[PDB]
Amino acid sequence: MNTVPFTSAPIEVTIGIDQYSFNVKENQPFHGIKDIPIGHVHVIHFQHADNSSMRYGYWFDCRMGNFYIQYDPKDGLYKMMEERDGAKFENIVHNFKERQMMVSYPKIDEDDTWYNLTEFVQMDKIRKIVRKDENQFSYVDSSMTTVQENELSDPAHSLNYTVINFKSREAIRPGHEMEDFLDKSYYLNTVMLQGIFKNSSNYFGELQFAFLNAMFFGNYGSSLQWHAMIELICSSATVPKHMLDKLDEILYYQIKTLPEQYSDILLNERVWNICLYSSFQKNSLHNTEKIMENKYPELL
C-alpha cells in the first residue's frame, strides 16, 4: 500500500482518487492519501471550489517513484512532484500517518471496479499519449485537445491518441472502397491491431484511458476517442472472439461506473444504437446491452 502525501491544502478543493472523491476545506489540516493499492495505475484529480471550471489531475503509478502534492500559489494549482530523497519521503509520510492526517484509499475487498476499468492501462502507454518525459506522472485536464482535434492548438499540451478516421486513405484500400467502409475489419485488424497497436491489450488500454479521461475530466476529445474505438470494433465483421468477449466486459464496467447524471453528455446516442442494434456485433455484447437497456433506455 503506497502513499501520496500533501504538503498542505491552502484552497478549498474536491479531490478525486480513482473513482472516489472527497472535499477539503480551505486550510483544512489534510496531508494526503494512504493505502493506495500497488499494482494499478491511479489518477488523483482536483476541482477547485471557487472555479468548478478546469478539472485537472495526474496519472501515476506508485511503483515508479515517490510522489507528493504541493499547492503552487503562483500557478494556482495542486502540483504533483517527485521526491528523490527516499529517506526524507519515508520520514515525512510516517509523521503524517502517526498524526492521522490522511484519508485512506477506501477499497472494499469484494470490489474489482478499479481493476476492471484499468486492466489494460499502462503508465508507459499513458506517457506516450501525454508527452512530458521529464516527469514519471502525467497531467491531464478538461480542456486539453487531441491531435485529431488539432488537425480539425499547443502541441506540447495535447492528447496524442491514435488517430482513427473512417473516411481516410488509411482506413480504405483502393479497390475495396465499399467493402472496407461497410466492414472495417481491414482497418481494425491489419492497420490498427497488427500495424499500430501490435496487440489487443494496447488497443484496449487506450480505449480505457480515453474513457477515464472523459469521465473524470469531462474531456471531449477523449470521449470522441473512446466512441471511435468502440465503433471500429463494432463495425468490423471479423473480430477475434476473445476481443469481443473482453470488450463486452470493458464496456459493462464503464457503463456501470458512469455517473447516472452524466449519461446525456458522455454517451453518443448514434454510436451506441448503431453498435448495439445495427452493427456486425449487435448480438455479441450481451452484458453491455443488458446494462445499457436497464440503466439508459432513454438513450436507446
Partner 1 sequence: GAMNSSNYAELFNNDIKLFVDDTNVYRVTVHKTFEGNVATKAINGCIFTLNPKTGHLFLKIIHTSVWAGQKRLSQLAKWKTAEEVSALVRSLPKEEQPKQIIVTRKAMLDPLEVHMLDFPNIAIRPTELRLPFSAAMSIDKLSDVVMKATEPQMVLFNIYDDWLDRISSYTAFSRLTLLLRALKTNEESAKMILLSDPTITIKSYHLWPSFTDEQWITIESQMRDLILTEYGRKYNV
Q: End-to-end distance of the chain based on CA atoms, in angstroms? A: 42
Residue found under cell 502540483: 79
Q: Which of 87, 108, 156, 178 binds partner 1 (CB under 8 A)?
A: 178
**Residue whose CB is less far from partner 1, 71 or 181:** 181
Nearer to partner 1, 107 or 282 (CB): 282
Q: How far is the CB of 180 from partner 1 (least distance, A)?
A: 8
Site for partner 1 in 140-169 (CB under 8 A): 167-169
Pairwise CA distance, residues 228 & 31, whole Å:
40
Helices (H), 13-106: 86-98
Q: How far is the CB of 153 from partner 1 (least distance, A)?
A: 21
> Which CB atom, from 181 or from 296, has the smaller least distance to partner 1?
181
The yes or no reply on residue 278 touching partner 1 (CB under 8 A) is: no
- Kindly tell me which of 174 and 297 has the beta carbon lying closer to partner 1: 174
CA distance 13 to 281: 43
Q: After which residues is the chain broken (C to N over 2.5 A)?
A: 152
Q: From the CB of 188, what's the least distance to partner 1, in Å?
A: 17
Q: Is 270 in the site for partner 1 (CB under 8 A)?
A: no
Contact residue for partner 1 among 81, 107, 157, 181 (CB under 8 A) = 181
How far is Cα 8 from Cα 26, in angstroms, rounded to an integer? 10
Nearest Cα residue to 225 out of 151, 296, 160 = 160
Does 186 help bind partner 1 (rule: CB under 8 A)? Answer: no
**Least distance to partner 1 from the beta carbon of 164, Å?**
15
Residue 182 beta carbon to partner 1: minimum distance, rounded to whole angstroms: 8
**172 is an interface residue for partner 1 by CB under 8 A:** yes
The three-class DSSP label of residue 23 is: strand
- Measured distance CA(160)–CA(146) in Å, rounded: 6
Q: Return the SS3 of 261.
A: helix
Q: How far is the CB of 220 from partner 1 (least distance, A)?
A: 23
CB of 177 to partner 1, least distance (A): 5
Helix, strand and coil content of the chain, in percent to the nearest 5, comes to 45, 20, 40
| Size of site (CB under 8 A) for partner 1 | 7
CB 242 within 8 A of CB 250: no
Binding site for partner 1 (CB under 8 A): 167-169, 172, 177-178, 181
